[PDB]
Amino acid sequence: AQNPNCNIMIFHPTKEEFNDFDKYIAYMESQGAHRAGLAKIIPPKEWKARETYDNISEILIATPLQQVASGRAGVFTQYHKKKKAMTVGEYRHLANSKKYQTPPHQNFEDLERKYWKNRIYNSPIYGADISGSLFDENTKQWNLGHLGTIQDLLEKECGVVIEGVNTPYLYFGMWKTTFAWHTEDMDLYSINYLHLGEPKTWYVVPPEHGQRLERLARELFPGSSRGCGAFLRHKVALISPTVLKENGIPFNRITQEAGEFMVTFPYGYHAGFNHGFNCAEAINFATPRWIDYGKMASQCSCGEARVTFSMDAFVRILQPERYDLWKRGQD
Ligand SMILES: O=C(O)CNC(=O)C(=O)O
Ligand SMILES: [Mg+2]
Ligand code: NI
Ligand SMILES: [Zn+2]
């Protein structure tokens, strides 16, 4: 078995190997990358996502989200408070203000210590889930707006044509902006490209150990657990690496820098935080190996998780028994 300790693998494809996306994902998996739940892909030196980032300040963040925490330093939840619209230019200025900027620090490790110590006492503002793309239309390789669609993958594997579309999303982050512990909708893969700015630190639990994370989460968030059998779908719970180590949960950590891709694999729980002003682009995708995960994915039916139009058809075809109850939670 390849990668039996489930370590995060880092890949360095040649320009030749960067031509065929599907084939490279399949290569990574042949080397055991999926066991970790997350992989890093450094693009060939000749590759670029676009010529410059000089003209992005007029992008609108229609609903910036202030991330308000409750709980203790290592075990907390966050809620999102809606703020007034601002442009990317305005957001970058805010990120760099004395109130929100990254603090002095020695290295990534010191910054990580400071995040876990202090996150709960601040409320950073995140520009999340903005439909759109920063890839140049002439970038032919690993262009997240030109991937094969999940709907076409399900059609090719299962023979059923379904409605729905699949487009990327932009994330504008600042110091301490946080992504809570989750897997993707329908336990899909995701791919994330850090276009610019400061890094993003990731934590991941191997897919083979996801249920251990879920059990710990039920113990640490006992009211949430009673309210919904899949409350991590709400994307609000944070658990520190110290707490995970104390409870014997297997996980790994890695820092992503500007110009690098991360891939999350089906049922790989992940969480993390941004180091300072940055812009990431991400999209879900599928492969033939995903189908069985899709069929088994948990769902939130309490009504909190509230998801896209396109997830309907996935639930309808892959999880017909669940479909009825899950749509009640959607409506
Ligand atoms: O970048 C973020 O805030 C969160 N991204 C993801 O969870 C992802 O790409 O799967
Ligand atoms: Mg602009
Ligand atoms: Ni994710
Ligand atoms: Zn729920």
UniProtKB/Swiss-Prot annotation:
Annotated JmjN domain residues: 8-50
Boundaries of every JmjC domain copy: 136-302
Record's comment on post-translational modification: Ubiquitinated via 'Lys-63'-linked ubiquitin chains. Deubiquitinated by USP14 with the help of TRIM14 leading to stabilization.
UniProt-recorded Gene Ontology molecular function terms: chromatin DNA binding; damaged DNA binding; histone demethylase activity; histone H3K9 demethylase activity; histone H3K9me2/H3K9me3 demethylase activity; metal ion binding
Cofactor note (record): Binds 1 Fe(2+) ion per subunit.
Residues reported in the UniProt entry to bind 2-oxoglutarate: 126, 192, 200, 235
Residues where PolyADP-ribosyl glutamic acid is found: 16-17
Keywords for this protein: ADP-ribosylation, Chromatin regulator, Dioxygenase, Iron, Metal-binding, Nucleus, Oxidoreductase, Transcription, Transcription regulation, Ubl conjugation, Zinc
Top enzyme category: oxidoreductase
E.C. code: 1.14.11.66
Cofactor(s) listed: Fe(2+)
GO BP annotations, alphabetical order: cellular response to ionizing radiation; chromatin remodeling; double-strand break repair via homologous recombination; inflammatory response; positive regulation of chromatin binding; positive regulation of double-strand break repair via nonhomologous end joining; regulation of gene expression; regulation of protein phosphorylation
Subcellular location: Nucleus
Binding of Zn(2+), residues: 228, 234, 300, 302
Catalytic reaction(s) noted: N(6),N(6),N(6)-trimethyl-L-lysyl(9)-[histone H3] + 2 2-oxoglutarate + 2 O2 = N(6)-methyl-L-lysyl(9)-[histone H3] + 2 formaldehyde + 2 succinate + 2 CO2
Residues given in the record as Fe cation binding sites: 182, 184, 270
Chief site of localization: nucleus
A Gene Ontology cellular-component term: pericentric heterochromatin
Family note: Belongs to the JHDM3 histone demethylase family.
Function per UniProt: Histone demethylase that specifically demethylates 'Lys-9' of histone H3, thereby playing a central role in histone code. Does not demethylate histone H3 'Lys-4', H3 'Lys-27', H3 'Lys-36' nor H4 'Lys-20'. Demethylates both di- and trimethylated H3 'Lys-9' residue, while it has no activity on monomethylated residues. Demethylation of Lys residue generates formaldehyde and succinate.
Protein name (database record): Lysine-specific demethylase 4D
Biological source species: Homo sapiens
